[PDB]
Design a protein around this ligand. Structure first.
Ligand SMILES: CC(C)C[C@@H](C(=O)N[C@H]1CCCCCCCCCCNC1=O)[C@H](O)C(=O)NO
Ligand SMILES: [Ca+2]
Ligand SMILES: [Ca+2]
Ligand SMILES: [Zn+2]
Ligand SMILES: [Zn+2]
Length: 164
């Protein structure tokens, strides 16, 4: 596992998140469920607790954007890069952005939103990419059975390293 350079981290263990917009590919409930499950993966392996808020400023903003959206990391249309997130900090810090031009799913078809969101939240918490191909923080998307999916050991060692 690899920690984000400078070892950024949240000082508080109770964090909020807000879904600013949705993709037309899934129902709002389906998007909400995928995001919640993604956060819960991290909760089982750390002392962090995440709460959804419907108005106000959340620690982690979740949004669907396309091409150039003003943050210096433009998306690239279908395929290529799927999403990106920012290290712990105020404002844009901790936020997660998903490429609106992808076909998002909750199945084995590309690109399962749950698995992508799970990976992004690792960044939101201070983790960098892993060189273990079996790790969630590995830099390439790969479908894994989602029903009883839990965090691989490398990812556990990583968040424990920061918050344990
Ligand atoms: C791990 C994934 C959920 C996010 C990263 C990502 O989008 N990786 C892509 C790398 C491959 C690009 C080369 C094209 C190959 C076609 C595959 C399409 C799916 N894309 C990827 O797997 C993202 O870079 C990231 O690390 N964000 O935190
Ligand atoms: Ca893309
Ligand atoms: Ca933020
Ligand atoms: Zn962005
Ligand atoms: Zn990544």
């Amino acid at each position: 596992f690899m920690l984000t350079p400078g070892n950024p981290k949240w000082e508080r263990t109770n964090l909020t998140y807000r879904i600013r917009n949705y993709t037309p590919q899934l129902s709002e409930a389906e998007v909400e469920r995928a995001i919640k499950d993604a956060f819960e993966l991290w909760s089982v392996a750390s002392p962090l607790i995440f709460t959804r808020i419907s108005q106000g400023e959340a620690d982690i903003n979740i949004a669907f954007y396309q091409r150039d959206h003003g943050d210096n990391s433009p998306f690239d249309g279908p395929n290529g890069i799927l999403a990106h997130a920012f290290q712990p900090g105020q404002g844009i810090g901790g936020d997660a952005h998903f490429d609106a031009e992808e076909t998002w799913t909750n199945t084995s078809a590309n690109y399962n939103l749950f698995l992508v969101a799970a990976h992004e939240f690792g960044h939101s918490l201070g983790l960098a990419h892993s060189s273990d191909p079996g790790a969630l923080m590995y830099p390439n998307y790969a479908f894994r059975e989602t029903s009883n999916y839990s965090l691989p050991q490398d990812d556990i060692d990583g968040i424990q390293a920061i918050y344990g």
